[PDB]
Amino acid sequence: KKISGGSVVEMQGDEMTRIIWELIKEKLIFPYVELDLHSYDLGIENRDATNDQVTKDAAEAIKKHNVGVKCATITPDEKRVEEFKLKQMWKSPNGTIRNILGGTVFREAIICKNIPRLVSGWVKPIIIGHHARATDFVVPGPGKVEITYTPSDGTQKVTYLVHNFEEGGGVAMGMYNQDKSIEDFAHSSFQMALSKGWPLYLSTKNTILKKYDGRFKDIFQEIYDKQYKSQFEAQKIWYEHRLIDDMVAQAMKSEGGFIWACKNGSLGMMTSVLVCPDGKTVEAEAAHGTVTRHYRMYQKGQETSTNPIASIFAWTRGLAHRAKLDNNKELAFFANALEEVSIETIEAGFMTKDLAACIKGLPNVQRSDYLNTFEFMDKLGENLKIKLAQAKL
Amino acid sequence: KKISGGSVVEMQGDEMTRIIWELIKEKLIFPYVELDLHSYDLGIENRDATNDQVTKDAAEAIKKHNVGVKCATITPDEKRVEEFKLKQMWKSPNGTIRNILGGTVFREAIICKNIPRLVSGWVKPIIIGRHARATDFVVPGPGKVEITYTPSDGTQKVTYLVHNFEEGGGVAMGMYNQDKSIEDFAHSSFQMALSKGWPLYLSTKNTILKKYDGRFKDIFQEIYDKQYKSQFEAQKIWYEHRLIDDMVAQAMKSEGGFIWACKNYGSLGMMTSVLVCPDGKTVEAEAAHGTVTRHYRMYQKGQETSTNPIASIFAWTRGLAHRAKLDNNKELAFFANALEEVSIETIEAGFMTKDLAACIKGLPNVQRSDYLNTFEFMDKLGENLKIKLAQAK
């Protein structure tokens, strides 16, 4: 009978994704798992009606229950405001959540043998985690641009000359970064390496930006030694700093299987995951958007061919983490079974137009080559039911 | 019956590239062309023995004679210093030469019809040109870090604060850009678009850093109309800006055949590189790859090697094409084109090195009968060049 899921914060999105999102939930998740579901509706209309209140609530909920899976949501601009008569132009919910939760987002392309990688050497996937401010202005004519720092303890103020424009004009910039943000970026990155049981590489450019990127390299080591070095060995893992050039060269000549945290391939396969520093809280979401083009055709009754893998893994990565926290072996296994069924269904010849396009090039793609949105969800459901029954032994 | 090419500054390199470099001169260039050769020996040993003076001299030589063709050269690290018993870790020759000549570099993959591209639609080459100080410091913090600009003018004074630390210090920095630098980028770029008779695109992420990238979009426009519009229309060409995202996309749907200027922050034997000084006079052509050390270590052991000489060859052809262009040397200009044709033809005709046979069949499926070794391929190109030059007579 059903699996004891636990508390999970689900968040519904917009357009095409919101549609495939309902199919995932009922076909691949519900028939097998029971969840204390804290479901919030981040549909643009509802964010409007509730004055974005809902978005904040949802972030507050994730903060509490540590686990949240999200559907792609419309981030509004001029065109959207007119499209929906939006009483205002609301901020990207991801942005809202990110500020309330913090942490570092990690992306990972799931790899199928028969999927033309951007380098045929990667049989194992590579998780990347960008760090995430700029005060730029224009210099009209001759003048002096300096960057000063005034300490709050009344200490001597310090002024650096960034450039002294003696003839023409130009442009200028100011950039910053608190220690707290770098620490959070480190822990996020270390814990992520542990969960995925893989090595952690920090690429930087502290040869030039000696003081700037230097701080990064330090903050990381200081943390990696005071903490996390022991556990890293407990899994044969290690953390090592590589200059941005050694990395990129090493990575191409690499078979993947590591976490790349740098300071700075189909989308239906890409999955973004926010990892809060505490190692407790996590949000998971597809990298792609709402796929509006597909949605348009869907509305007109036309046949659509959307890839649901990115969205599916948002659930499995979320659920996986839920199990992790709760020692739920039953759930832990289900997550896997689903991820596998997904990769396997594809490595068996069943896929959507976009994936088929990878193999035979967009033009040469005939209808017989791919499955549209529905029957592909079905195919996954079938294989899922199967795989699961097989495990019962 | 030898063509007379004229004055050409040549730089010799290290390891495997030094080998094929001499093969090209002996087999493909010298037998047909006579040059007032200003040849400099940028071998790692000679640089050491001369205290990298040879490098500065070669840069001064190019600055004077307008044309320089360079062989791949070892850039020393700690392992190099120990290997060659160097008496210093000399700076990258490329860097030394750049600092002296200035200008913008343009990379371009040589395209073959029997060789796979990233976009199978790409039939015409795509030339890309990126834009290559900054004061950074550590914030003890907290405190207000502000960037101020006071016009030498003496009048106004504006202060923006990059951040006000309260949590505790971190790190900050200040960027800048001469107007000059952007103008030189523009000229260098526009000229390449004309000399290659292709449309110029400038991609940037204006949205994010409006003020910075804004100055780029403008200066380009300003200089275009003021100086370069006629020529473009004359050659049925044009220039036009785009955001990175709209660039990547309309590119994926293109056949190529355009210059691409990146303001922004496959096989290598086919990757060339040209440094275009803004004066429109001086140029340096070189392979985009290294000395191919792994291949050299094999050569040293007596093992058979298969190194792609295409990039190296095109360093000569691009160079000679520009000498001709400068001297209105019809003959030379023809030979340059003839040599580029013989190369792409030989490859499209089945004869190629191992790395290329890999692009078509993939590593694990390459047989010895699918490619030629370094010396066989060079011999093959030799035969055809002789024929091509015979038929055109």
Ligand SMILES: NC(=O)c1ccc[n+]([C@@H]2O[C@H](COP(=O)([O-])OP(=O)(O)OC[C@H]3O[C@@H](n4cnc5c(N)ncnc54)[C@H](OP(=O)(O)O)[C@@H]3O)[C@@H](O)[C@H]2O)c1
């Ligand atoms: N809330 C979020 O997390 C989030 C994030 C980013 C963007 N968005 C919203 O996304 C909306 C539109 O996004 P977008 O226009 O950038 O499109 P998208 O959803 O980002 O995807 C762009 C295009 O790539 C292709 N594609 C992406 N995912 C696909 C999939 N699963 N299956 C098949 N094809 C796929 C489709 O084009 P083709 O099939 O024509 O090639 C799609 O139209 C915007 O309102 C934006 O605000 C939301």
Ligand SMILES: NC(=O)c1ccc[n+]([C@@H]2O[C@H](COP(=O)([O-])OP(=O)(O)OC[C@H]3O[C@@H](n4cnc5c(N)ncnc54)[C@H](OP(=O)(O)O)[C@@H]3O)[C@@H](O)[C@H]2O)c1
């Ligand atoms: N001044 C320059 O132009 C320049 C630039 C970069 C590096 N370097 C020097 O290059 C030396 C070594 O370079 P590296 O280690 O980066 O190697 P590389 O010369 O950059 O190339 C290494 C790999 O590139 C592939 N490759 C590049 N050119 C090739 C060609 N023509 N034919 C076949 N394969 C080619 C080969 O792959 P396979 O392993 O599959 O055979 C080779 O193993 C270093 O000392 C560096 O200082 C010089």
